[PDB]
Protein backbone atom coordinates (compact mmCIF):
# COMPACT_ATOMS: atom_id res chain seq x y z
CA UNK A 1 0.00 0.00 0.00
CA UNK A 2 1.30 3.20 -0.64
CA UNK A 3 1.67 5.90 1.87
CA UNK A 4 0.34 9.41 1.11
CA UNK A 5 3.49 11.16 1.13
CA UNK A 6 5.23 11.65 -1.92
CA UNK A 7 5.15 15.68 -1.43
CA UNK A 8 9.06 15.28 -0.97
CA UNK A 9 13.47 15.11 0.04
CA UNK A 10 15.28 12.01 -1.83
CA UNK A 11 14.24 8.51 -2.03
CA UNK A 12 16.57 7.33 -0.02
CA UNK A 13 15.09 8.70 3.03
CA UNK A 14 13.43 6.23 5.59
CA UNK A 15 10.03 8.39 6.17
CA UNK A 16 7.17 7.86 8.45
CA UNK A 17 4.57 9.30 11.18
CA UNK A 18 6.17 9.76 14.44
CA UNK A 19 2.05 14.63 17.96
CA UNK A 20 1.47 16.89 15.94
CA UNK A 21 2.33 15.89 11.74
CA UNK A 22 5.34 14.41 13.15
CA UNK A 23 7.35 12.10 10.59
CA UNK A 24 11.05 10.83 11.12
CA UNK A 25 13.28 10.45 8.11
CA UNK A 26 16.93 8.61 8.40
CA UNK A 27 20.32 8.55 5.73
CA UNK A 28 23.09 7.06 7.11
CA UNK A 29 23.45 7.90 10.41
CA UNK A 30 21.40 11.26 9.97
CA UNK A 31 17.84 11.49 11.46
CA UNK A 32 15.89 14.46 11.47
CA UNK A 33 12.89 14.97 13.29
CA UNK A 34 10.19 16.88 10.64
CA UNK A 35 6.92 18.85 11.15
CA UNK A 36 3.95 20.48 8.66
CA UNK A 37 3.08 23.63 9.14
CA UNK A 38 4.72 24.54 12.26
CA UNK A 39 4.34 27.76 13.54
CA UNK A 40 6.56 30.91 13.12
CA UNK A 41 7.29 30.55 16.81
CA UNK A 42 9.62 27.35 15.90
CA UNK A 43 12.66 29.97 14.78
CA UNK A 44 12.83 31.30 18.45
CA UNK A 45 12.23 28.32 19.90
CA UNK A 46 15.77 27.08 18.38
CA UNK A 47 17.90 30.30 18.54
CA UNK A 48 16.92 30.60 22.06
CA UNK A 49 17.86 26.45 22.99
CA UNK A 50 14.26 25.25 23.72
CA UNK A 51 13.79 22.71 21.54
CA UNK A 52 16.46 20.60 19.13
CA UNK A 53 17.47 23.00 16.90
CA UNK A 54 16.57 23.80 13.51
CA UNK A 55 18.35 22.24 10.43
CA UNK A 56 16.27 23.55 7.54
CA UNK A 57 13.08 25.35 6.29
CA UNK A 58 11.43 25.04 2.96
CA UNK A 59 8.09 26.80 1.56
CA UNK A 60 6.54 24.33 -0.59
CA UNK A 61 4.58 25.67 -3.74
CA UNK A 62 0.93 25.58 -1.53
CA UNK A 63 2.73 27.20 1.11
CA UNK A 64 3.51 24.74 3.36
CA UNK A 65 5.91 25.46 5.71
CA UNK A 66 8.42 22.01 6.37
CA UNK A 67 10.78 22.34 9.12
CA UNK A 68 13.59 20.01 9.75
CA UNK A 69 15.33 19.60 13.42
CA UNK A 70 18.39 17.50 14.55
CA UNK A 71 16.34 14.15 16.23
CA UNK A 72 17.23 13.75 19.69
CA UNK A 73 18.55 10.73 21.66
CA UNK A 74 17.39 10.49 24.80
CA UNK A 75 14.78 9.75 26.87
CA UNK A 76 11.62 11.72 28.26
CA UNK A 77 12.44 13.16 32.16
CA UNK A 78 10.61 11.32 34.72
CA UNK A 79 8.81 13.01 37.80
CA UNK A 80 12.43 12.42 39.77
CA UNK A 81 13.62 13.87 37.75
CA UNK A 82 11.35 17.72 37.42
CA UNK A 83 12.98 18.81 41.06
CA UNK A 84 16.00 19.34 39.58
CA UNK A 85 17.92 22.52 38.44
CA UNK A 86 17.86 22.32 34.74
CA UNK A 87 14.32 22.17 34.78
CA UNK A 88 14.04 25.10 37.03
CA UNK A 89 16.45 26.89 35.21
CA UNK A 90 15.06 26.47 31.65
CA UNK A 91 11.70 26.96 32.54
CA UNK A 92 13.01 30.48 33.81
CA UNK A 93 14.79 30.94 30.55
CA UNK A 94 10.92 30.45 28.88
CA UNK A 95 9.60 32.98 31.61
CA UNK A 96 12.02 35.43 31.18
CA UNK A 97 12.40 35.43 27.32
CA UNK A 98 11.29 38.85 25.81
CA UNK A 99 12.44 37.16 22.61
CA UNK A 100 9.45 34.13 22.83
CA UNK A 101 6.89 36.85 24.41
CA UNK A 102 7.53 39.20 21.07
CA UNK A 103 6.24 36.48 18.57
CA UNK A 104 3.62 35.34 20.51
CA UNK A 105 2.18 39.00 20.82
CA UNK A 106 3.22 39.87 16.66
CA UNK A 107 0.80 36.28 16.48
CA UNK A 108 -1.70 38.01 17.77
CA UNK A 109 -2.44 36.06 21.69
CA UNK A 110 -4.57 37.63 24.28
CA UNK A 111 -3.27 38.04 27.76
CA UNK A 112 -5.07 35.57 29.51
CA UNK A 113 -6.46 36.88 32.77
CA UNK A 114 -8.32 34.86 35.46
CA UNK A 115 -11.53 37.16 34.76
CA UNK A 116 -12.18 36.12 31.67
CA UNK A 117 -10.39 32.38 32.19
CA UNK A 118 -13.09 31.78 35.35
CA UNK A 119 -16.49 32.62 33.12
CA UNK A 120 -15.24 30.08 30.69
CA UNK A 121 -15.71 27.13 33.31
CA UNK A 122 -18.62 26.64 32.15
CA UNK A 123 -19.66 23.20 34.06
CA UNK A 124 -22.61 19.40 35.04
CA UNK A 125 -20.86 19.52 38.42
CA UNK A 126 -20.91 16.88 41.45
CA UNK A 127 -20.84 18.54 44.75
CA UNK A 128 -17.06 18.56 45.52
CA UNK A 129 -17.13 20.87 41.76
CA UNK A 130 -19.40 23.36 43.03
CA UNK A 131 -17.37 24.11 46.59
CA UNK A 132 -14.36 24.17 43.77
CA UNK A 133 -16.01 26.96 42.07
CA UNK A 134 -16.53 28.78 44.96
CA UNK A 135 -12.85 29.03 45.95
CA UNK A 136 -11.93 30.51 42.29
CA UNK A 137 -14.81 33.14 42.76
CA UNK A 138 -14.11 34.12 46.19
CA UNK A 139 -10.31 34.32 46.11
CA UNK A 140 -9.88 36.19 42.52
CA UNK A 141 -9.64 39.32 44.27
CA UNK A 142 -6.10 38.12 44.97
CA UNK A 143 -4.98 36.47 41.69
CA UNK A 144 -3.42 39.48 39.64
CA UNK A 145 -0.38 39.75 38.70
CA UNK A 146 0.51 42.24 35.58
CA UNK A 147 4.02 41.19 34.17
CA UNK A 148 2.83 38.28 31.91
CA UNK A 149 5.44 36.16 30.03
CA UNK A 150 5.10 32.94 27.50
CA UNK A 151 3.47 29.79 29.61
CA UNK A 152 3.78 26.63 27.94
CA UNK A 153 0.47 25.27 29.81
CA UNK A 154 1.03 21.51 29.76
CA UNK A 155 4.47 21.68 31.58
CA UNK A 156 3.84 17.76 32.36
CA UNK A 157 6.99 15.40 32.47
CA UNK A 158 6.49 13.79 29.74
CA UNK A 159 7.06 16.88 27.52
CA UNK A 160 10.75 17.21 28.67
CA UNK A 161 13.43 15.89 26.85
CA UNK A 162 16.82 14.88 28.13
CA UNK A 163 19.50 13.94 25.39
CA UNK A 164 22.69 11.79 25.86
CA UNK A 165 24.55 15.12 24.75
CA UNK A 166 23.59 16.73 28.24
CA UNK A 167 20.78 19.01 26.70
CA UNK A 168 17.55 19.77 28.25
CA UNK A 169 14.38 20.42 26.16
CA UNK A 170 11.11 21.17 26.09
CA UNK A 171 8.50 20.18 23.78
CA UNK A 172 5.05 20.61 22.27
CA UNK A 173 4.41 24.29 22.18
CA UNK A 174 0.86 24.46 20.83
CA UNK A 175 -0.54 25.79 23.98
CA UNK A 176 1.44 28.39 24.69
CA UNK A 177 -0.50 31.10 25.94
CA UNK A 178 0.86 34.59 27.61
CA UNK A 179 -0.21 34.41 31.09
CA UNK A 180 0.94 34.50 34.54
CA UNK A 181 4.03 32.76 35.41
CA UNK A 182 2.30 30.76 38.48
CA UNK A 183 -0.24 29.00 35.45
CA UNK A 184 2.76 27.12 35.01
CA UNK A 185 4.90 27.09 38.03
CA UNK A 186 1.60 25.91 40.04
CA UNK A 187 1.29 22.57 38.52
CA UNK A 188 4.53 22.14 38.09
CA UNK A 189 5.43 22.31 42.18
CA UNK A 190 2.01 20.72 43.37
CA UNK A 191 2.59 17.50 41.40
CA UNK A 192 6.57 16.70 41.63
CA UNK A 193 7.70 18.87 44.18
CA UNK A 194 7.68 18.42 48.36
CA UNK A 195 6.56 21.54 49.44
CA UNK A 196 9.28 21.62 51.69
CA UNK A 197 11.39 21.73 49.10
CA UNK A 198 9.52 24.59 47.04
CA UNK A 199 11.23 27.67 48.29
CA UNK A 200 14.58 25.72 47.42
CA UNK A 201 13.34 25.30 43.98
CA UNK A 202 12.04 28.47 42.99
CA UNK A 203 15.55 29.91 44.42
CA UNK A 204 16.82 27.90 42.00
CA UNK A 205 14.56 29.59 39.63
CA UNK A 206 15.20 32.87 40.72
CA UNK A 207 11.97 33.56 42.60
CA UNK A 208 11.05 34.48 46.40
CA UNK A 209 8.24 32.12 47.74
CA UNK A 210 6.18 35.32 48.56
CA UNK A 211 2.58 35.22 49.66
CA UNK A 212 1.08 36.15 46.81
CA UNK A 213 2.68 33.54 45.38
CA UNK A 214 1.48 30.72 47.36
CA UNK A 215 -2.02 32.10 46.45
CA UNK A 216 -1.45 32.33 42.79
CA UNK A 217 -0.22 29.17 42.41
CA UNK A 218 -2.92 27.13 44.21
CA UNK A 219 -5.51 29.39 42.14
CA UNK A 220 -4.11 28.09 38.87
CA UNK A 221 -3.26 24.06 39.80
CA UNK A 222 -7.21 23.91 40.95
CA UNK A 223 -8.24 25.86 38.10
CA UNK A 224 -6.17 23.10 36.25
CA UNK A 225 -7.79 20.41 38.36
CA UNK A 226 -11.35 21.22 37.40
CA UNK A 227 -11.53 22.64 33.96
CA UNK A 228 -9.53 19.06 32.98
CA UNK A 229 -12.63 16.86 34.93
CA UNK A 230 -14.84 19.28 32.06
CA UNK A 231 -12.96 18.02 29.59
CA UNK A 232 -14.00 14.42 30.16
CA UNK A 233 -17.67 15.42 30.16
CA UNK A 234 -17.59 14.73 26.82
CA UNK A 235 -14.31 9.86 28.96
CA UNK A 236 -16.20 8.57 31.96
CA UNK A 237 -13.09 6.57 32.94
CA UNK A 238 -10.20 8.93 33.46
CA UNK A 239 -13.24 11.83 34.72
CA UNK A 240 -13.80 9.12 38.16
CA UNK A 241 -9.56 9.49 38.65
CA UNK A 242 -9.39 13.21 38.73
CA UNK A 243 -12.06 13.87 40.90
CA UNK A 244 -9.92 11.37 43.72
CA UNK A 245 -6.89 13.72 42.54
CA UNK A 246 -9.27 17.16 42.92
CA UNK A 247 -10.13 15.89 46.38
CA UNK A 248 -6.60 15.40 47.75
CA UNK A 249 -6.30 19.19 45.94
CA UNK A 250 -8.38 20.55 47.85
CA UNK A 251 -7.44 19.05 51.31
CA UNK A 252 -4.25 21.00 50.79
CA UNK A 253 -5.70 24.25 50.33
CA UNK A 254 -8.35 24.27 52.95
N1 LIG B 1 13.29 17.59 17.49
C1 LIG B 1 12.41 16.88 18.20
N2 LIG B 1 11.23 17.46 18.53
C2 LIG B 1 10.35 16.76 19.25
N3 LIG B 1 10.44 15.51 19.71
C3 LIG B 1 11.62 14.96 19.35
C4 LIG B 1 12.62 15.56 18.63
N4 LIG B 1 13.70 14.68 18.46
C5 LIG B 1 13.30 13.60 19.08
N5 LIG B 1 12.05 13.68 19.65
C6 LIG B 1 11.34 12.68 20.42
O1 LIG B 1 12.28 11.96 21.21
C7 LIG B 1 11.98 10.55 21.14
C8 LIG B 1 13.02 9.86 20.30
O2 LIG B 1 14.23 9.68 21.04
P1 LIG B 1 14.97 8.29 20.93
O3 LIG B 1 16.07 8.31 21.93
O4 LIG B 1 15.36 7.95 19.48
O5 LIG B 1 13.76 7.30 21.32
P2 LIG B 1 13.81 6.11 22.35
O6 LIG B 1 12.47 5.39 22.23
O7 LIG B 1 14.01 6.64 23.79
N6 LIG B 1 15.06 5.03 21.96
P3 LIG B 1 14.72 4.08 20.59
O8 LIG B 1 13.47 3.15 20.90
O9 LIG B 1 15.92 3.23 20.29
O10 LIG B 1 14.40 4.99 19.33
C9 LIG B 1 10.57 10.48 20.56
O11 LIG B 1 9.62 10.66 21.60
C10 LIG B 1 10.59 11.65 19.58
O12 LIG B 1 9.29 12.13 19.26
Redesign the pocket.
Known amino acids: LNIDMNWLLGSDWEIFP?TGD?YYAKHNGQQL?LKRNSSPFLAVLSAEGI??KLVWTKRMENGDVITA????????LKPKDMSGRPVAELLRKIHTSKALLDMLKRLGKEPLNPGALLSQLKQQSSPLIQEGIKYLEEHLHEVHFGEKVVCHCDVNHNNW?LSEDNQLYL?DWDGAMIADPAMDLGPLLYHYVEKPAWESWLSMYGIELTESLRLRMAWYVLSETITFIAWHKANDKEFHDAMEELHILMKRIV
Open positions: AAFVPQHWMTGRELI
